[PDB]
Amino acid sequence: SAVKAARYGKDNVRVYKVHKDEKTGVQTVYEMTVCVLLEGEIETSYTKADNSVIVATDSIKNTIYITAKQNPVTPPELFGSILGTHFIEKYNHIHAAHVNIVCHRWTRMDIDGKPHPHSFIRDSEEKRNVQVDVVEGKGIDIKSSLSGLTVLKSTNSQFWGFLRDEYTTLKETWDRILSTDVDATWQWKNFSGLQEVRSHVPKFDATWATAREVTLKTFAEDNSASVQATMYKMAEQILARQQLIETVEYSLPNKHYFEIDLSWHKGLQNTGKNAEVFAPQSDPNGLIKCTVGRS
Amino acid sequence: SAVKAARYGKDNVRVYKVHKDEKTGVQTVYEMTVCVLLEGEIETSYTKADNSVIVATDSIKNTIYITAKQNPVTPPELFGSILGTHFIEKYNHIHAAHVNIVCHRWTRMDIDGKPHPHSFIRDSEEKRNVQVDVVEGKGIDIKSSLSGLTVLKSTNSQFWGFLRDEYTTLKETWDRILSTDVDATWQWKNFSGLQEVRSHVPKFDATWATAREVTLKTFAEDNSASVQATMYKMAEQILARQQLIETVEYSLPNKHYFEIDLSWHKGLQNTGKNAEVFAPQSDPNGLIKCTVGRS
Amino acid sequence: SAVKAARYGKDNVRVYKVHKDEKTGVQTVYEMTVCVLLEGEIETSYTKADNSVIVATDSIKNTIYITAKQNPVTPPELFGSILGTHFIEKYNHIHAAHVNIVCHRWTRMDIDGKPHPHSFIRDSEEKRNVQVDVVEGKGIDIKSSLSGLTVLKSTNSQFWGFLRDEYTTLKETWDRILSTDVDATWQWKNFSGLQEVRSHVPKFDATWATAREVTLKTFAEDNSASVQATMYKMAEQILARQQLIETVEYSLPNKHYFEIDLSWHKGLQNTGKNAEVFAPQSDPNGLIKCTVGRS
Amino acid sequence: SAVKAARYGKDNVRVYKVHKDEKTGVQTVYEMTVCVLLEGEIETSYTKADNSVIVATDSIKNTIYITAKQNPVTPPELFGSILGTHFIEKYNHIHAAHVNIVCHRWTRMDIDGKPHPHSFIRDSEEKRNVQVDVVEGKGIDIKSSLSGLTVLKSTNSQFWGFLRDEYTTLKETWDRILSTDVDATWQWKNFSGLQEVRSHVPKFDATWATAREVTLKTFAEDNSASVQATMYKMAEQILARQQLIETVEYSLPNKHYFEIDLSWHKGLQNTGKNAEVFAPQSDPNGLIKCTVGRS
Ligand SMILES: O=c1[nH]c(=O)c2nn[nH]c2[nH]1
Ligand SMILES: O=c1[nH]c(=O)c2nn[nH]c2[nH]1
Ligand SMILES: O=c1[nH]c(=O)c2nn[nH]c2[nH]1
Ligand SMILES: O=c1[nH]c(=O)c2nn[nH]c2[nH]1
Ligand code: NA
Ligand code: NA
Ligand code: NA
Ligand code: NA
């Protein structure tokens, strides 16, 4: 037998950082969950019980805190790139670092119409994520995403004209509820190293904001022919607005809401044009994916 | 042996309702999870296999959908009271109904600065809940609550002057992070029946809004001596603003964020006044409760 | 306003303890999650910011570890009683302690047909729990339970003869699947104090074992007329076998498995006597409760 | 823009099947959660709103139930291969099917030392899984796994001799607790089609049993130098026992249990050789992965 692939590190490292403006008294908080996995010349830890090649996962944890102390943690694309680069530069035998960051929302409270200097609310479990792969001699690959963005529209969704055969019971419809949890990922062109990532810092927050805005507007305004058609429109627009993105991937559940026929009860009308009360279905769910790139 | 207490019914009934304004084209959605448990002269179903006394839980489910079709589902205090009353009026041998409703957020989207007519976002997993106990000959008892409101302040929280003995290691502090998930419940005076609940309909949404506003403002503005002292200030204000409330109960976890001593690493200063990076603790957590009533 | 009720403490305290037999080399592990909430003369911490009356929740945490170091942690009824008594004896102004313990399964591995001395497996998320209320001058009240015991029988369950009216669509059945997650609680007679709890130590594990055995056997062997009738048979037997129990409470979801009509597809027969493939329903679910006591 | 990749289908399809032996009266149940995603000539559903190429996800759901009605559902490797093959054979424009199956445990109850004919218990949330990729013209690729197998050993684990630098605080140890949740995957050699999968049917259950047995025995008996070294020993043995496996992958969290220094309290000794009470850590956790193949 031989080791074909190996990686190891620390997962689920929760980190909070506060920035305090001495002039204004305004404080800003960041909270993330971080995972770092390393690869390199470590096969002998598996095959020969040679621990000398192991940077202990506990040390990886310490390194995350130290790096957060000495560097900006925003945008997460930058922090992830700093953190990954550290490991390949510090340890001769480590040749790749894989950094995943999940950013949790702490949104400044408005109290009596004014932004509060040091109080925050978790407005939704929507996350902003990054995956950063730092590979020695191959640069820095960054995938940015938003996830857990849950939306619903109560009309202006259709689904007709699909294949009908002996396995089909679904009725065509020209008016249905459409609800999903949005997972959207944009992959940046490969960066040569940290200097290049630094050069593009302003683009990271702006592209996240654009991706979110395009997602919401397209969902709200499209008279949707299918999840497939609406998601493609989203991806097309993001690629048009940021030339440094190579691909956009969407993964969308179709969270079904079923009509309830109540006609058995005193002829009550609750289907089609008369439908008011529906039964949300926890499972199963459609799952629709697509990756869109450039011609 | 004897049956000392019994209740049964249907839990986890998901319900969605849409309201469509024909004039404006504006649609409004409501989504809830409902539980209904019944009590009454049903002992023989347990002791003698006498199913004749059982309103099937499946029928309870149907009743929830039918009731939602024929009645307003908002405010939930009203819907719960209608639903509970139905069972005690319809079935001679049923003498109490216990209705729990959890309301999920579907907040209208703003697209380009204007409210969208039929598109919604789940902005946080904060819930608005009601528990309604309808007891034949004893009226309607309603407990309203908000839950899952997660907040954090990065300063203006203190904790000193507590009991110190041989079990104590905690250091006194004049500046710490305070974070919690708010669970707040206000109990209404007993209502004589549905007519009285209807008479107070406007008070339900207004009191929820007040409870939420008082919670947020007090949390943000109090230079907190402890969770105990801050929560009492919240409860006091709610009772002052709504005379039909008899008690207010808060249940608050103290979600700890620990300083990380980094001085072992090149004398890095990250404690006390120099603290920037902290470790959020998933467990354990303080849990502080209080019920406040009138003199 | 006035404080009507207050309690506070530490939740979610994870504790592991190992016992090592020097003679045999056999090791035995216990893992629990503990919550302790205190009541007493603490109103002024809420109303006056008087922290002098507060035993810090951090100190409660330390006390749990110290108590586990110096005492047996099994049976949990005993450990809970020791822990609760500590607080009322140590602190003059604390008058009640409420201790909840959840015990996690670590079952010794059998390797090649022999019990391993120090290796364990988590065989299911079934828990053994205790709630212990130690109230000064009123003794020790203990509720023991098992929870998360998930079972299914594929036949020998019936449900017919229930009330039928204009809200009823459920068909009567003489053969259905019955599946539930068992939550069973037995409440002990009040104990005068720790000496009396110690005197009954052997009864605690034996009664848990009996409760579990009666639950499983009755479920498997009863040709069930309803969840109500089967659960009553369980409770009756437990009360018969342990005279120091005052009441038994069961809370049982009815986890539905629906027939799937496939007759639309080439006349495939999958209902009634021909039913082979079913659709488990995640929600909604029936919920059936009963508390059984002595004549 | 262009569609670079696309797949769609139905997720979270819960399925139960019962087998009834008419001769013996013995019943056997299977419960699974199934996901099926399709690929093929479907780009126009995304780019042109052409639904004619879409096999509706609802129809995929129906197909899963029909296929389960007409075929064995065990071993899951076979069922997955039947299900995947169906889609590529039935639909000209569908060229790949991706089938994921999670099998839930329903273990026959022993009542009074005898196996019960129709009563079952969920003994742990351990799963047996398969991923089957059926690709037209490229055969059938099957990855089998077990997951959610949670184990702990209280001694006979060591970790010393790792890299020490200015980021290291971890002390070397010759005796620690080791606990993990095992995720183990074995990848079969590519099969040419369904006939070949059928020819190897007996190997599937046998290899699962072997993988589980090797995992448990190795964990229990290895005086472990690290998670890395122990997991490699596991993978080596599985590859030795089944020649039709090409690779074995393990992914193991290191679930930490920390010593608690109690010496501040009356000199209580609870570290090193005196350690009895530990604090299980929910997060962070080490994460160690390896893929082992043949020389
Ligand atoms: O078994 C281990 N492997 C590791 O890589 C490691 N790092 N810290 N502790 C550890 N334990
Ligand atoms: O066992 C049952 N008890 C009930 O009360 C019920 N209601 N619907 N189905 C049921 N099954
Ligand atoms: O606000 C607090 N209240 C308490 O009771 C406590 N105990 N430890 N820390 C604490 N903080
Ligand atoms: O938008 C949809 N896309 C699909 O592929 C599908 N299949 N069933 N319903 C559906 N809705
Ligand atoms: Na390197
Ligand atoms: Na009545
Ligand atoms: Na006392
Ligand atoms: Na094909």
Rg (CA), chain D: 24
Paired with A191 in beta bridges are A140
Cβ–Cβ < 8 Å for D94, D53? no
Cα of D239 vs its chain's centroid, Å: 17
Cβ–Cβ < 8 Å for D9, D36? yes
Tokens found for residue A105? 């929302």
Helix, coil or strand: residue C115: strand
Cα of B182 vs its chain's centroid, Å: 9
d(CA A176, CA A272): 9
d(CA B229, CA C50): 9
Cα of C247 vs its chain's centroid, Å: 14
Distances in whole angstroms, Cα of residue D147 to Cα of each of D77, D218, D251, D290: 16, 17, 10, 15
Cβ–Cβ < 8 Å for A8, D232? no
Q: Find the DSSP H helices in C191-294.
A: 194-199, 201-221, 227-241
- Pairing label, strands A114-121, A107-111: antiparallel
d(CA B240, CA A219): 44
Residues in chain D: 295
Cβ–Cβ < 8 Å for C57, B254? yes
Distances in whole angstroms, Cα of residue C99 to Cα of each of A116, C13, C84: 39, 11, 6
Residues of B in contact with A152 (CB under 8 A): 29, 106, 119-120, 122
Place of tokens 């974070």: B179
d(CA C293, CA C249): 9
Single-letter amino acid, residue D97: A
Cα of A81 vs its chain's centroid, Å: 17
Tokens found for residue A170? 């679904």
Exposed e or buried b per residue across D213-226, where buried means at least 16 C-beta atoms within 10 angstroms of its C-beta: ebbbbbbbbbebbb
Q: Output DSSP code: residue B262.
A: -
Q: Find the DSSP H helices in C124-200.
A: 194-199
Single-letter amino acid, residue C132: V
Ligand 1 pocket member A229 (CB < 6 A):
no
d(CA A266, CA A18): 62
Cβ–Cβ < 8 Å for A277, B64? no
Q: Output DSSP code: residue A48.
A: S
Cβ–Cβ < 8 Å for C238, C211? yes
Is the backbone of residue D62 left (phi > 0), alpha (psi -120 to 50) or beta?
alpha
Q: Output DSSP code: residue B41.
A: S
Report chain C's terminal Cα–Cα distance, integer Å.
Answer: 43
d(CA A194, CA A201): 11
D29 appears as a binding residue in the annotation: no
Is the backbone of residue B124 left (phi > 0), alpha (psi -120 to 50) or beta?
left
Place of tokens 């096969």: A43
d(CA A92, CA A103): 30
Closest Cα to residue B14, out of C60, A225, A182, A260?
A260
d(CA A66, CA B277): 9
Q: Output DSSP code: residue A55.
A: B
Q: What angle in degrees, to the nearest 10, is found between the helix axes of D201-221 and D227-241? A: 150
Cβ–Cβ < 8 Å for A141, A132? yes
Closest Cα to residue A17, out of A57, A58, A71?
A71
C214: CB partners within 8 A, 6+ apart: C234, C237, C238, C241
Q: Output DSSP code: residue A155.
A: S
**Domains, chain B:** 1-295 (3.10.270.10)
Tell me which of C260, C263, C264, C285 to substitute to probe the interface with A (most A C-beta atoms closer than 10 Å): C264
- Pairing label, strands A114-121, A127-135: unpaired
Is the backbone of residue A267 left (phi > 0), alpha (psi -120 to 50) or beta?
left
d(CA D88, CA D60): 13
Place of tokens 């100190």: C59
Tokens found for residue C150? 């998930």
Q: Which ligand has its closest atom nearest to the C-alpha of B42?
A: 2
d(CA C59, CA B170): 7
Paired with D173 in beta bridges are D159
Cα of A37 vs its chain's centroid, Å: 19
Single-letter amino acid, residue C22: E
d(CA C226, CA B94): 19
- Identify which of A257, A288, A290 to mutate to test ligand 4's pocket (most ligand atoms within 8 A of the CB): A288
Closest Cα to residue C147, out of C104, C101, C183?
C183
d(CA C221, CA D216): 34
- Phi, psi torsion values for D292, nearest 5 degrees: -115, 130
Q: Output DSSP code: residue B157.
A: B
Question: Which ligand 2 atom sits nearest the alpha carbon of residue C178?
Answer: 1
Beta-strand runs (E) in B21-57: 27-40
d(CA D94, CA D99): 14
Cβ–Cβ < 8 Å for A31, A15? yes
Cα-Cα-Cα-Cα torsion A227, A229, A230, A235, nearest 10 degrees, comes to 120
- Pairing label, strands D2-20, C285-293: unpaired
Q: What stretch of H or E contains B58? A: helix B57-70
Is the backbone of residue B84 left (phi > 0), alpha (psi -120 to 50) or beta?
alpha
Q: Indicate which residue of D28, D33, D44, D57 is catalytic.
A: D57
- Phi, psi torsion values for A200, nearest 5 degrees: -105, 10
D81: CB partners within 8 A, 6+ apart: D99, D132, D134, D140, D142, D191, D194, D197
Single-letter amino acid, residue C116: H
Cβ–Cβ < 8 Å for D249, D289? yes
Single-letter amino acid, residue D179: S
d(CA B261, CA B280): 14
Single-letter amino acid, residue B196: E
Q: Find the DSSP H helices in chain A.
A: 43-47, 57-70, 76-90, 194-199, 201-221, 227-241
Cβ–Cβ < 8 Å for A277, A270? yes
Question: How many Cα atoms occupy the beta-carbon half-sphere of B264 within 13 Å?
Answer: 12
d(CA A232, CA B191): 54
Distances in whole angstroms, Cα of residue A53 to Cα of each of A45, A85, D50, D228: 7, 18, 55, 12
- For this entry, resolution in Å reads 1.6
Cβ–Cβ < 8 Å for C285, A284? no
Residues of A in contact with B221 (CB under 8 A): 111
3-state helix, strand, coil in chain B (%, to 5): 30, 40, 30
Write out chain D in H/E/C secondary structure: CEEEEEEEEEEEEEEEEEEECCCCCCEEEEEEEEEEEEEECCHHHHHCCCHHHCECHHHHHHHHHHHHHHCCCCCHHHHHHHHHHHHHHHCCCEEEEEEEEEEECCEEEEECCEEEEEEEECCCCCEEEEEEEEECCCEEEEEEEEEEEEEEECCCECECCCECCCCCCCCCECCCCEEEEEEEEEEECCECCHHHHHHCHHHHHHHHHHHHHHHHHHHHHCCECCHHHHHHHHHHHHHHHCCCEEEEEEEEEECCEEECCCCCCCCCCCCHHHCCEEEECCCCEEEEEEEEECC
Closest Cα to residue D20, out of C177, C162, C24?
C177
Cβ–Cβ < 8 Å for C68, C176? no
d(CA B154, CA B173): 14
- Phi, psi torsion values for B28, nearest 5 degrees: -135, 135
Helix, coil or strand: residue A14: strand
Distances in whole angstroms, Cα of residue B190 to Cα of each of A265, B195, B256, D61: 33, 13, 38, 49
Burial (CB count <10 Å: 0-12, 13-18, 19+), residue A192: exposed
Q: What stretch of H or E contains B215? A: helix B201-221
Helix, coil or strand: residue A260: coil
* Whether D256 is catalytic: yes
Question: Which ligand 3 atom sits nearest the alpha carbon of residue B178?
Answer: 1
Q: Output DSSP code: residue C171.
A: P
Ligand 1 pocket member D226 (CB < 6 A):
yes
Burial (CB count <10 Å: 0-12, 13-18, 19+), residue D26: middle
Q: Which residue of C57, C232, C284 is in closest CB contact with B13? A: C284
Closest Cα to residue D142, out of D103, D186, D183?
D186
How many angstroms separate the alpha carbon of residue D281 from the centre of ligand 1? 15
Rg (CA), chain A: 24
d(CA B285, CA C11): 5
CB contact under 8 A, A166 and C265: yes
Report chain A's terminal Cα–Cα distance, integer Å.
Answer: 43
Place of tokens 């084209």: B25
Cβ–Cβ < 8 Å for D60, D38? yes
Place of tokens 């769910």: A285
How many angstroms separate the alpha carbon of residue B104 from the centre of ligand 2? 28
Cβ–Cβ < 8 Å for C126, C147? yes
Tokens found for residue D151? 């184990």
Cβ–Cβ < 8 Å for D54, D45? yes
Is the backbone of residue D232 left (phi > 0), alpha (psi -120 to 50) or beta?
alpha
D26: CB partners within 8 A, 6+ apart: D117, D118
- Identify which of B172, B177, B252, B288 to mutate to test ligand 3's pocket (most ligand atoms within 8 A of the CB): B288
CB contact under 8 A, D163 and A56: yes
